[PDB]
Amino acid sequence: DHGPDPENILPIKGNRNLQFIKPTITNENILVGEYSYYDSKRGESFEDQVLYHYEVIGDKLIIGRFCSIGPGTTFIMNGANHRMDGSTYPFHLFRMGWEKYMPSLKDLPLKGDIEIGNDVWIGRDVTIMPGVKIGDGAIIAAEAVVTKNVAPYSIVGGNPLKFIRKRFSDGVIEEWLALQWWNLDMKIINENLPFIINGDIEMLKRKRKLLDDT
Amino acid sequence: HGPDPENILPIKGNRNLQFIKPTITNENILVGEYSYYDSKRGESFEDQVLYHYEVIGDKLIIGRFCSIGPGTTFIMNGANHRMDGSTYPFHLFRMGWEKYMPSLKDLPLKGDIEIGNDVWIGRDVTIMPGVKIGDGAIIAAEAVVTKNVAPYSIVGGNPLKFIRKRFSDGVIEEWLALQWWNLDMKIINENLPFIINGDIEMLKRKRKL
Amino acid sequence: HGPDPENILPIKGNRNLQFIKPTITNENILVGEYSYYDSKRGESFEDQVLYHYEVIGDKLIIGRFCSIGPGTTFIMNGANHRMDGSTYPFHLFRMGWEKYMPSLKDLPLKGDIEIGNDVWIGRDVTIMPGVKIGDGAIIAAEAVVTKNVAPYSIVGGNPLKFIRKRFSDGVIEEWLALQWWNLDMKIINENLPFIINGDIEMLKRKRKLLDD
Ligand SMILES: CC1=C\[C@@H](O)CC(=O)Cc2nc(co2)C(=O)N2CCC=C2C(=O)O[C@H](C(C)C)[C@H](C)/C=C/C(=O)NC\C=C\1
Numbered sequence: 001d002h003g004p005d006p007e008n009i010l011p012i013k014g015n016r017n018l019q020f021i022k023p024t025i026t027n028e029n030i031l032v033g034e035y036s037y038y039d040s041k042r043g044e045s046f047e048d049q050v051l052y053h054y055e056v057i058g059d060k061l062i063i064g065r066f067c068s069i070g071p072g073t074t075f076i077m078n079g080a081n082h083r084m085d086g087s088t089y090p091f092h093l094f095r096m097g098w099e100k101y102m103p104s105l106k107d108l109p110l111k112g113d114i115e116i117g118n119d120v121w122i123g124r125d126v127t128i129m130p131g132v133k134i135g136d137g138a139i140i141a142a143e144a145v146v147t148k149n150v151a152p153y154s155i156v157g158g159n160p161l162k163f164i165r166k167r168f169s170d171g172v173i174e175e176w177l178a179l180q181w182w183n184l185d186m187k188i189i190n191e192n193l194p195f196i197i198n199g200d201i202e203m204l205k206r207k208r209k210l211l212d213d214t
Numbered sequence: 215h216g217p218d219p220e221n222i223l224p225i226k227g228n229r230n231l232q233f234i235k236p237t238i239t240n241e242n243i244l245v246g247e248y249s250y251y252d253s254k255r256g257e258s259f260e261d262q263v264l265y266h267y268e269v270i271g272d273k274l275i276i277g278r279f280c281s282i283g284p285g286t287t288f289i290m291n292g293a294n295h296r297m298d299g300s301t302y303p304f305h306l307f308r309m310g311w312e313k314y315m316p317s318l319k320d321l322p323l324k325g326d327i328e329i330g331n332d333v334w335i336g337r338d339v340t341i342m343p344g345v346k347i348g349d350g351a352i353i354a355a356e357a358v359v360t361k362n363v364a365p366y367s368i369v370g371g372n373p374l375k376f377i378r379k380r381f382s383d384g385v386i387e388e389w390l391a392l393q394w395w396n397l398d399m400k401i402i403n404e405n406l407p408f409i410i411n412g413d414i415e416m417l418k419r420k421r422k423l
Numbered sequence: 424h425g426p427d428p429e430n431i432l433p434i435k436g437n438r439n440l441q442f443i444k445p446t447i448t449n450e451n452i453l454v455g456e457y458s459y460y461d462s463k464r465g466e467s468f469e470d471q472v473l474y475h476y477e478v479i480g481d482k483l484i485i486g487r488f489c490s491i492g493p494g495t496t497f498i499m500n501g502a503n504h505r506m507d508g509s510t511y512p513f514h515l516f517r518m519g520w521e522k523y524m525p526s527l528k529d530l531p532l533k534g535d536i537e538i539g540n541d542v543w544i545g546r547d548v549t550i551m552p553g554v555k556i557g558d559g560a561i562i563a564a565e566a567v568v569t570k571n572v573a574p575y576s577i578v579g580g581n582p583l584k585f586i587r588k589r590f591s592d593g594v595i596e597e598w599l600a601l602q603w604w605n606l607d608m609k610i611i612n613e614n615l616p617f618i619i620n621g622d623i624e625m626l627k628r629k630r631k632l633l634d635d
Pocket residue numbers: 267269270292293294295296303306315316317318321437440461490491492
């Protein structure tokens with residue numbers, strides 16, 4: 001039964017900044033898994049960090065489980081991109097006649113969902129651009145601007161984004177990905193926590209094979 | 215048709231987005247019509263202009279129909295320290311040190327910051343002293359503009375890197391020749407469908423006409 | 424001649440620029456005389472030091488005569504997560520998970536942030552854990568200082584890019600040897616014109632050393 005309640009918005013005692021993200025969600029098209037947290041700068045909500053996010057565009061921000069999201073991380077959804085065929089100036093917003101030129105979505109450089117995997121560590125003041133996919137077990141350095149996709153279990157950073165290194169060998173990465181501990185039962189996760197935490201992936205692999213029954 | 219460019223808040227119900235020119239209060243800031251600052255929480259465009267001192271006399275110049283995203287910052291020449299020896303500004307602290315005040319030629323001043331027409335500037339861009347940004351350029355959010363940007367190019371990063379030109383040299387040459395931003399508003403309103411869709415062939419046509 | 428380095432606000436009418444040393448209250452921070460922080464809104468220098476926990480024991484050391492820009496942040500090692508397996512900080516949430524409290528040896532510590540003398544640090548710079556910045560350096564605004572910075576060099580960008588040395592390697596060696604910032608103020612006052620205009624040759628003479 002060990003562990004915090006993922007429905008608890010403020011699961012750390014005395015801490016008014018660190019929030020479990022899922023039970024704070026109020027808007028639709030934001031799907032965040034359990035235990036993922038946002039460590040706010042000054043109590044702001046995770047949703048306030050989601051920008052240019054309009055229902056009319058229908059783009060989604062999707063985040064998995066057990067993610068660590070640092071203060072000031074911002075998620076720039078698709079409302080940020082201007083029409084780029086002619087002038088970038090948005091005449092229609094000003095109306096008084098120009099409302100005629102309200103653009104159709106097909107004319108916008110739309111990008112699709114922001115998708116973030118599980119067990120992802122996102123540093124302070126990272127900016128995430130529209131359409132970006134970030135793999136399981138990634139680490140994004142502070143102040144990065146995530147301008148392209150991020151491989152699972154990789155470390156990246158900078159503006160624009162440079163790949164830095166792989167966290168483990170490809171064999172070990174493959175095994176973390178076949179393990180998927182974040183999708184296991186909490187009872188199973190607790191049992192395996194010492195090894196999930198110390199990186200004893202060989203042990204985790206044996207416990208997984210043991211349970212196979214296949 | 216069109217909003218009044220002297221309207222500080224041209225969109226109804228929107229207290230963040232401001233036409234810049236009717237907000238200008240300070241000297242040496244010259245901004246063209248219809249250019250806007252989409253503020254974060256209503257702060258004024260002027261207060262995004264930093265280290266701007268009259269005794270240096272550098273200017274910030276911005277053309278028409280520019281989109282300036284929230285948190286865009288302009289760093290003027292007052293930011294630069296003397297770089298011959300120590301960068302420490304002894305004179306500021308006086309008490310005898312005021313006599314080490316640098317002359318203007320001691321300082322590495324870099325001139326005016328000039329942004330052209332129809333430039334889209336991303337959220338939280340920082341602009342360095344002396345930078346020239348061409349018409350129709352696009353500056354990606356979070357960029358630190360450390361060097362000049364060509365007309366109709368897309369740039370980004372810290373430091374700034376070239377990403378791509380928006381069109382072929384020929385079409386650009388043609389937009390630059392057209393200079394639609396300097397037409398009368400009656401003519402602009404007439405030609406908006408093609409300014410927006412980039413039908414430059416049609417634009418040359420109607421303008422010859 | 425010169426201001427009182429213990430005067431927190433050494434410029435008349437200015438409530439933003441602070442001599443840093445007399446504002447320090449925290450352990451594990453040491454900042455040299457005359458170094459200043461030009462705050463955005465009156466915030467203190469210590470408010471710009473982040474993830475600094477005594478139990479980790481990392482130190483922030485800054486030399487003398489440094490110019491520190493508005494918004495400059497110092498990230499110490501309390502931000503580092505364990506990287507052996509999952510980065511998720513289970514122990515924080517307790518309720519059984521506090522038994523997974525890491526040891527300091529489990530954490531990827533970067534050591535102290537050490538900043539030399541006569542350093543110019545631009546606005547909105549971010550300094551990462553364990554970085555060393557040599558004397559006379561210049562860090563461009565908005566830089567993220569991800570690695571060590573050679574003395575009298577210019578750097579910038581995210582991640583940090585080397586730009587150029589300020590002087591020839593010979594002249595840098597001469598500044599480094601002189602260490603004007605450690606000289607008695609009477610001597611520094613006698614030599615200010617040349618410290619400021621960069622005339623190292625003349626500075627060398629004015630000292631009149633034992634090996635002429
Ligand atoms: C950026 C910097 C220091 C900062 O890190 C801290 C500040 O910003 C605080 C500040 N600075 C000031 C008033 O508060 C201030 O008043 N400045 C700084 C901007 C011009 C003058 C000034 O003296 O003008 C004189 C003329 C009268 C000849 C010349 C231009 C001075 C130039 C100069 O020495 N640049 C060194 C840079 C100072």
